[PDB]
């Protein structure tokens, strides 16, 4: 009986960070309380000033990552403030019944609701808005995130050996369908509702105009690059709520990867490129061995470099000549 | 010697049902006899009244599912009635040699042929028409289905434990390429051959006009929804002969999934969304824990909700408040 | 210390062949020396006479397959001849650091460089050119190939039983983006640079004009078909540096498949169709049981038969009636 379990509130943090949590824990099942607030906003998505009429959990794309342990209950209050124009709900892929909770969380602007569900399966799971009659529009406008359900004893390799990360990062990849006018330029809409019909038309062609990590071209670059050091293990959580992606770390690997995202299954090792099915989240472990600026990207290189599905990881530390060495620098072809 | 083995005739049933069969059997290898008849027919594929000049096994999309056990021989009589326009054949992915049997089953209208092959590998396999020079057209027009080859001792989890289902369902997903006229309306053809050049032109764009389960938009909805109850285990067989898909059960999971469809390989557990490669069939087991109407869909949500790749499962039984509970119904935000 | 290890030179061979190598070896780690030369060239890619302003490793698409053993070092000299227009480099997915080696191998026309890296992870790995600001263009123009890093003890099934092949074949699949003029005909460029802006425009649509094995429509057909015999085991290495593919052997199977291409992971068996993620190479074993001409293809059948992603394997030997038999040849339906 979940009603008689300990109840704890967790404060969420903005992507690419994940809120503080234990991996292995000695503690028993708890009801973990989260709150999220829908924010509809116009967002600049590229270095030309192209805007999206966006819909977000907590003002960000992706929504924040919620972390519990297997056997815990997730208890979410979803707030849809009167400042919004559309109704919303939430469908958790980690939950069982009522369309993921969508049937029980239909909130019109000015309303809120509270859902509890048992997180009885370990893994990274997508959550997204799913209002009947307009599911794809709400999802592609930015309403998705990840729930991570860790095993109580933490992550394990195929032989049951413990795997540990020093930092988790969360990347949400968003296929965007921005309409154009007769002049060939991207439309700019005064309101969210004005964007609807044209956006649906672009959606039906199945060709995204942009594909971005975390809400914009270059979101995870420059001052906002991910960071690490040699010897550090990172967990990279990657969600795509609508479309397939194929993550790749340039100069690195996926040491252990759950590409389907489910921790009771044995991970795969040494992956160059992995595969996140549209409507899922996956996770990769990597321990950095070389310093430098890595690219983390969708390995359809057109989608990465032309459409925006790429970020950076800046890594400090000592170069290893055993792993890689320049034997002869670029120089004239000998006579 | 396959000639001296027992012979049995099996009567096929229309999708989404699968003909009665044993899972684990004490029986030895048999030659199992099936007959199918190719039916070319004009089919209404959506609610606007759009038609496809279709090609079907037994008048349905997908063709019926054929079930045998590993070690059995499949003996199919393929009939191409005098009233059809085109030559046809059959290519079984479960078979070895002669292009899956296509080379041995070249039937013009007014002809029939009988092929035997050994089903020596367990799994769900695509079969489809493959007439020389005309393969993609015949496949996308509806000519595919599934052969399920069960292990003699039935399905097993990764640790060798027996897995039973109470009901198998078969879903065939079809990417359609319907031409449009200068007015931007879908073309309606008097004959199959009239539709050919225009369809190839759409196919080459690699963008489907429609993507449907079992022959039309909403085919597995309303009175034709799949049904189950709480406590029942269903096997969901999903085929896609031409294009990738990513099945998802909203409010449910894949308890045990063979996404590549081959039963000698350990399945994966707890999947939110799985992946069927174009040119293959996969299988998922799920045991229902909550009542209600579920959606079963391709989790590219545009393909599901805009293009038609979605169905329903109507489930009876008792709601489980432990697995999911509405703690606070949608209500005003406290001022 | 890698500098003190034995050094050997390897002579590469043109695809679809792979240079002579041991599977299991008693040899210890070695620095294995290769040299490749970038060749920019206009290439005829289809029957209609359509050309590509192509960029190639050693004049071929794909580049040749480099084969080492786990724990070896790869030492590549990359030559960019004085007669080329563009700067180049190489990114090995099998390497660790400096963007797969791309940062250390920036060669302008007239220059060369030598890179060493430890091949410490077994599997088939993509390598490709990756010049700053120009990555997708160079890759889709033909600059990719495979590095195969074999385990020292050769290939193993999931139970650890040895798996041996008689011949390895290497297939590179290339999605091409050829611009058209206002007349709807494919453009023919005098220079590589003239093709640039137009190609980027086609790339952004994400719709290939052609998808080819090994550099052109029908490259592995006719006199250039792959060959084999009944009882022979082949390894089929399949690489795709930019886009997903789904390999299928018509009338055959993947007996043991590493679809993510990493040999430390258990392979899967009996696959009808497998999946190569864009940005990876995979590998499949098959032992032939039937004679005949097989088709090896991308099982998006439009991409195979309309766009070019198909080849042939011609197989000699004795027909096996136990596996497949024509019981009744095509004949009039009985009246
Ligand atoms: Cl030929
Ligand atoms: Cu919403
Ligand atoms: Cu969903
Ligand atoms: Cu046909
Ligand atoms: Cu096929
Ligand atoms: Cu280059
Ligand atoms: Cu790469």
mmCIF file of C-alpha atoms in Angstrom, chain A residues 175-300:
data_model
loop_
_atom_site.group_PDB
_atom_site.id
_atom_site.type_symbol
_atom_site.label_atom_id
_atom_site.label_comp_id
_atom_site.label_asym_id
_atom_site.label_seq_id
_atom_site.Cartn_x
_atom_site.Cartn_y
_atom_site.Cartn_z
ATOM 1 C CA UNK A 175 12.715 17.032 -35.037
ATOM 2 C CA UNK A 176 11.132 20.401 -35.932
ATOM 3 C CA UNK A 177 8.679 21.236 -38.711
ATOM 4 C CA UNK A 178 8.852 25.014 -39.312
ATOM 5 C CA UNK A 179 6.599 26.288 -42.133
ATOM 6 C CA UNK A 180 7.774 28.549 -44.971
ATOM 7 C CA UNK A 181 5.920 31.249 -46.888
ATOM 8 C CA UNK A 182 5.755 31.771 -50.697
ATOM 9 C CA UNK A 183 9.074 33.693 -50.500
ATOM 10 C CA UNK A 184 10.882 30.570 -49.199
ATOM 11 C CA UNK A 185 11.464 32.060 -45.757
ATOM 12 C CA UNK A 186 10.447 30.596 -42.411
ATOM 13 C CA UNK A 187 7.180 31.951 -41.074
ATOM 14 C CA UNK A 188 7.082 33.882 -37.823
ATOM 15 C CA UNK A 189 3.788 33.537 -35.935
ATOM 16 C CA UNK A 190 2.280 36.033 -33.512
ATOM 17 C CA UNK A 191 0.538 33.191 -31.620
ATOM 18 C CA UNK A 192 0.779 29.441 -31.011
ATOM 19 C CA UNK A 193 -2.692 28.817 -32.531
ATOM 20 C CA UNK A 194 -1.691 30.641 -35.752
ATOM 21 C CA UNK A 195 1.152 28.118 -36.305
ATOM 22 C CA UNK A 196 -1.066 25.004 -36.209
ATOM 23 C CA UNK A 197 -2.421 24.378 -39.747
ATOM 24 C CA UNK A 198 0.836 25.199 -41.532
ATOM 25 C CA UNK A 199 2.890 23.059 -39.131
ATOM 26 C CA UNK A 200 0.626 20.026 -39.656
ATOM 27 C CA UNK A 201 1.207 20.438 -43.424
ATOM 28 C CA UNK A 202 4.994 20.288 -42.931
ATOM 29 C CA UNK A 203 4.684 17.349 -40.491
ATOM 30 C CA UNK A 204 2.861 15.285 -43.171
ATOM 31 C CA UNK A 205 5.866 15.558 -45.554
ATOM 32 C CA UNK A 206 7.863 13.767 -42.802
ATOM 33 C CA UNK A 207 10.865 16.038 -43.486
ATOM 34 C CA UNK A 208 12.062 18.118 -40.522
ATOM 35 C CA UNK A 209 13.304 21.637 -41.259
ATOM 36 C CA UNK A 210 15.616 21.438 -38.217
ATOM 37 C CA UNK A 211 16.757 18.725 -35.813
ATOM 38 C CA UNK A 212 18.137 20.126 -32.569
ATOM 39 C CA UNK A 213 19.606 18.932 -29.266
ATOM 40 C CA UNK A 214 18.035 20.651 -26.264
ATOM 41 C CA UNK A 215 16.033 23.360 -28.045
ATOM 42 C CA UNK A 216 18.343 25.113 -30.548
ATOM 43 C CA UNK A 217 21.189 24.693 -33.056
ATOM 44 C CA UNK A 218 24.387 24.801 -30.967
ATOM 45 C CA UNK A 219 22.563 24.471 -27.604
ATOM 46 C CA UNK A 220 25.314 22.124 -26.335
ATOM 47 C CA UNK A 221 28.264 24.117 -27.773
ATOM 48 C CA UNK A 222 30.523 27.002 -26.679
ATOM 49 C CA UNK A 223 29.917 28.070 -23.071
ATOM 50 C CA UNK A 224 27.088 25.509 -22.895
ATOM 51 C CA UNK A 225 29.223 22.555 -24.017
ATOM 52 C CA UNK A 226 29.089 19.428 -21.885
ATOM 53 C CA UNK A 227 32.265 18.970 -19.801
ATOM 54 C CA UNK A 228 34.331 16.041 -18.516
ATOM 55 C CA UNK A 229 37.873 14.967 -17.673
ATOM 56 C CA UNK A 230 40.107 11.992 -18.484
ATOM 57 C CA UNK A 231 39.197 9.119 -16.127
ATOM 58 C CA UNK A 232 35.615 10.286 -15.558
ATOM 59 C CA UNK A 233 32.637 8.085 -16.499
ATOM 60 C CA UNK A 234 29.583 9.850 -17.914
ATOM 61 C CA UNK A 235 26.107 8.494 -18.553
ATOM 62 C CA UNK A 236 24.593 10.058 -21.672
ATOM 63 C CA UNK A 237 20.788 9.825 -21.698
ATOM 64 C CA UNK A 238 19.307 10.417 -25.141
ATOM 65 C CA UNK A 239 15.574 10.753 -25.843
ATOM 66 C CA UNK A 240 13.665 11.113 -29.100
ATOM 67 C CA UNK A 241 9.891 11.119 -28.657
ATOM 68 C CA UNK A 242 8.949 11.063 -32.339
ATOM 69 C CA UNK A 243 11.757 9.989 -34.663
ATOM 70 C CA UNK A 244 14.725 7.619 -34.843
ATOM 71 C CA UNK A 245 18.219 8.870 -34.032
ATOM 72 C CA UNK A 246 21.702 7.291 -34.071
ATOM 73 C CA UNK A 247 24.000 8.800 -31.391
ATOM 74 C CA UNK A 248 27.769 8.806 -31.903
ATOM 75 C CA UNK A 249 30.615 10.257 -29.851
ATOM 76 C CA UNK A 250 33.387 11.397 -32.256
ATOM 77 C CA UNK A 251 36.769 10.183 -30.963
ATOM 78 C CA UNK A 252 34.979 7.983 -28.416
ATOM 79 C CA UNK A 253 32.603 5.030 -28.064
ATOM 80 C CA UNK A 254 29.667 3.720 -26.104
ATOM 81 C CA UNK A 255 31.496 1.555 -23.554
ATOM 82 C CA UNK A 256 28.217 0.056 -22.358
ATOM 83 C CA UNK A 257 24.982 0.975 -24.145
ATOM 84 C CA UNK A 258 21.324 0.188 -23.497
ATOM 85 C CA UNK A 259 20.048 1.441 -26.855
ATOM 86 C CA UNK A 260 16.463 0.328 -26.121
ATOM 87 C CA UNK A 261 16.990 1.909 -22.693
ATOM 88 C CA UNK A 262 15.948 -0.926 -20.393
ATOM 89 C CA UNK A 263 18.313 -1.790 -17.545
ATOM 90 C CA UNK A 264 17.166 -5.404 -16.882
ATOM 91 C CA UNK A 265 18.592 -6.272 -20.316
ATOM 92 C CA UNK A 266 22.338 -6.853 -20.848
ATOM 93 C CA UNK A 267 24.076 -3.753 -22.327
ATOM 94 C CA UNK A 268 26.189 -3.892 -25.495
ATOM 95 C CA UNK A 269 29.856 -2.895 -25.503
ATOM 96 C CA UNK A 270 32.273 -1.038 -27.826
ATOM 97 C CA UNK A 271 29.555 0.603 -29.925
ATOM 98 C CA UNK A 272 30.661 3.190 -32.462
ATOM 99 C CA UNK A 273 27.092 4.336 -33.145
ATOM 100 C CA UNK A 274 23.889 3.261 -31.386
ATOM 101 C CA UNK A 275 20.185 3.644 -32.164
ATOM 102 C CA UNK A 276 17.340 5.326 -30.296
ATOM 103 C CA UNK A 277 13.913 4.317 -31.713
ATOM 104 C CA UNK A 278 11.443 7.189 -32.103
ATOM 105 C CA UNK A 279 9.350 7.150 -28.909
ATOM 106 C CA UNK A 280 12.114 5.984 -26.564
ATOM 107 C CA UNK A 281 15.107 7.030 -24.463
ATOM 108 C CA UNK A 282 18.438 5.188 -24.379
ATOM 109 C CA UNK A 283 21.562 5.480 -22.272
ATOM 110 C CA UNK A 284 25.293 5.114 -22.885
ATOM 111 C CA UNK A 285 28.234 4.886 -20.494
ATOM 112 C CA UNK A 286 31.646 6.235 -21.489
ATOM 113 C CA UNK A 287 34.917 6.686 -19.601
ATOM 114 C CA UNK A 288 37.083 9.372 -21.214
ATOM 115 C CA UNK A 289 40.669 8.375 -22.043
ATOM 116 C CA UNK A 290 41.745 11.353 -24.189
ATOM 117 C CA UNK A 291 41.408 15.109 -23.568
ATOM 118 C CA UNK A 292 39.948 17.420 -26.232
ATOM 119 C CA UNK A 293 36.687 18.680 -27.667
ATOM 120 C CA UNK A 294 34.450 15.770 -28.693
ATOM 121 C CA UNK A 295 31.375 16.048 -30.880
ATOM 122 C CA UNK A 296 28.277 14.129 -29.801
ATOM 123 C CA UNK A 297 25.835 13.803 -32.671
ATOM 124 C CA UNK A 298 23.170 12.076 -34.722
ATOM 125 C CA UNK A 299 25.248 10.070 -37.236
ATOM 126 C CA UNK A 300 23.107 10.966 -40.150
#
